[PDB]
């Protein structure tokens, strides 16, 4: 298999045997160094695998693979390895990742993605994810002295546990909107994404939020800019565990006041 | 695929520079200091007298 079409068919044959079809040999399950660029998975595969409580893609290895401009939405992966792969510009609308490894991955998917990706019992170690995701169920581990993946454009990086998050270059209208306004964008924001974590990782959330605010202090901000996201900021920050954060509190204070004048 | 690499969200009123990378319009306007502007991806570029100028890339969709 030297091209995506071959890899598609190879999976498409291998996935089908996992109908199932039980059980599959390890060697045939490995898709190391695969290539799935520009592939739309539904067209090749059944709606069972791609909807509701249907079929599961279990026990695979997609290490060092390349999902780029591919569409992977609504699928469910379990016991899978995506280590070192690039999922940049993928379309993973409401894609589920269970008991999986997605460490050292590029997950800054394309905006086209409608529904937040969901990760459960999954690791995003040193994985740069887009700030709009569902991390309820994610496993976190101690951050190494690693470095953010080299990317073009955007701003500086903050750590969410051991996950990488990239701030915008400048806090502009759309920057503020997409990052903070989850009300206009129906539940999607970096606020919701940080808070999405399980209550277990309370401290990680706060440092992430604190770091997020630290970047918001730096930008020369204006009421006018924050006006459309006052409600959004408050809905998440005005509650624990972000009320026990002096940094967040003293910054949220004035913003919280104007909001209440309505 | 593409989004303003200042705001990192889908483009609004896209304006393409003469090197040529596309971004939101205000994203150019706010980024401009001392008039001049630079592509974040590579390097410097000319400023136009008012902003809200320079080719509006193909709009979709
Ligand atoms: Zn922009
Ligand atoms: Zn450029």
Author numbering:
A (entry chain A): 167 to 428
B (entry chain B): 18 to 78
Quote the study's own text.
The Salmonella T3SS effector protein SopA is a HECT-like E3 ligase that promotes Salmonella infection-induced inflammation. Lacking noticeable primary sequence homology to eukaryotic HECT enzymes, the crystal structure of SopA showed the characteristic bi-lobal architecture of HECT ligases. TRIM proteins constitute a large family of ∼70 RING-type E3 ligases, which plays a pivotal role in the host innate immune response against various pathogens. Here, using quantitative proteomics, structural and biochemical analysis we elucidate how Salmonella HECT-like ligase SopA specifically targets and inhibits human TRIM56 and TRIM65.
To circumvent this problem, we fused the minimal binding regions of TRIM56 (1–94) and SopA (163–425) using a flexible linker. The structure reveals that the first Zn2+-binding loop in the TRIM56 RING domain is packed in a cleft at the interface of the β-helix and the N-lobe domains of SopA. The structure of SopA in complex with TRIM56 overlays well with the SopA apo structure with a mean root mean squared deviation (r.m.s.d.) of 0.9 Å over all the C-α atoms. The interface of SopA and TRIM56 contains a mix of hydrophobic/hydrophilic interactions with a buried surface area of 750 Å2. In TRIM56, residues Leu25 and Glu26 contribute majorly towards interaction with SopA. Although Glu26 makes polar contacts with Arg296, His297 and Lys298 of SopA, Leu25 inserts into a hydrophobic pocket of SopA involving Phe345 and Pro334. Although, the first Zn2+-binding loop of all the aligned RING domains fits into the cavity between the β-helix domain and the N-lobe of SopA without sterical clashes, the central α-helix of various RING domains appears to be clashing with SopA and rendering the binding unfavourable. Hence, positioning of the central α-helix of RING domains relative to the first Zn2+-binding loop is one of the crucial factors defining the specificity of SopA. Further analysis of the SopA–TRIM56 structure indicated that SopA binding to the RING domain obstructs the E2-binding site of TRIM56.
